């Protein structure tokens, strides 16, 4: 009918929580192309031992 | 084709030093980095050692860091392993192998391995066996087939032949593997099935020759 057409707004603010926990398979697949372009100072600094 | 070649195994008292060696044939030696790998019984297949092509970084496993020393000469294209304070665990076949050809970015490991060479770190003194027969009875008849054998108890070290009748008698032969016992000696047995209707008339002998000591015996089974 003529129902509120707007938030309470005293609805619930916080978590479900049992909302959705899994990954959702439609999620973003592709890189994100503004990412962390610059090298981790916080990388591996020793030699692999795997190497040619 | 490719071809590895490892020497200088042998038997070793614990606490002393080996050096194996390992010559490397059909390819460009010197452009390719090296692997020790060993295998045993209780462990299975175990990494020990690689060395880079110069000789300029080398890695070894955790059990063995600090006491081997993998290293190389270029010019004579061998690889060496020298092996100091043995300890029991490390009795072993020990394999050389040689680092695939692949890409600058990936990781790399073995493609081709030696030939093995043993290793035995034990206490024992080198000692003949005894030969004691496996005498077939009635407790060893089912029907027409009975079962015989030879044990050969208290030798070290590994390995001894047994034959049957100077080779004469092969079908039918089963020799177990060697098992080692409490008191670092090996003993094995040899049984072989003959028809029950040539007891007492057909002669066996089993021929256990042992190198390391020069040990032949021809031991005769007798029925009870």
């Known amino acids: 009918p003529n129902a509120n057409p707007n938030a309470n707004p005293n609805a619930n603010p916080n978590a479900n929580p049992n909302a959705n926990p899994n990954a959702n398979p439609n999620a973003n697949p592709n890189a994100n192309p503004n990412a962390n372009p610059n090298a981790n100072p916080n990388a591996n600094p020793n030699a692999n031992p795997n190497a040619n | 084709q490719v071809q590895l070649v490892e020497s200088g195994g042998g038997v070793v008292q614990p606490g002393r030093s080996l050096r194996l060696s390992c010559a490397a044939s059909?390819?460009?030696?010197?452009?390719?980095?090296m692997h020790w790998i060993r295998q045993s019984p209780g462990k299975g297949l175990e990494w020990v050692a690689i060395?880079?092509?110069?000789?300029?970084?080398?890695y070894y496993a955790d059990s063995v860091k600090g006491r081997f020393t993998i290293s190389r000469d270029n010019s004579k294209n061998t690889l060496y392993l020298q092996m100091n304070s043995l300890r029991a665990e490390d009795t072993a076949v020990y394999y050389c192998?040689?680092?695939?050809?692949?890409?600058?970015?990936?990781?790399?490991?073995?493609?081709?391995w030696g030939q093995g060479t043993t290793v035995t770190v034990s206490s024992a003194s080198t000692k003949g066996p005894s030969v004691f027969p496996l005498a077939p009875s009635s407790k060893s008849t089912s029907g027409g087939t009975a079962a015989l054998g030879c044990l050969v108890k208290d030798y070290f070290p590994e390995p001894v032949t047994v034959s049957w009748n100077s080779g004469a008698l092969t079908s039918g032969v089963h020799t177990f593997p060697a098992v080692l016992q409490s008191s670092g000696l090996y003993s094995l047995s040899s049984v072989v099935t003959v028809p029950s209707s040539s007891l007492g008339t057909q002669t066996y002998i089993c021929n256990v020759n042992h190198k390391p000591s020069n040990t032949k015996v021809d031991k005769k089974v007798e029925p009870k």
């Open positions: 192998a040689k680092v695939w050809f692949g890409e600058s970015e990936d990781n790399y490991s073995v493609d081709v």
């Open positions: 059909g390819f460009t030696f010197s452009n390719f980095g």
């Open positions: 060395i880079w092509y110069d000789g300029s970084n080398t």
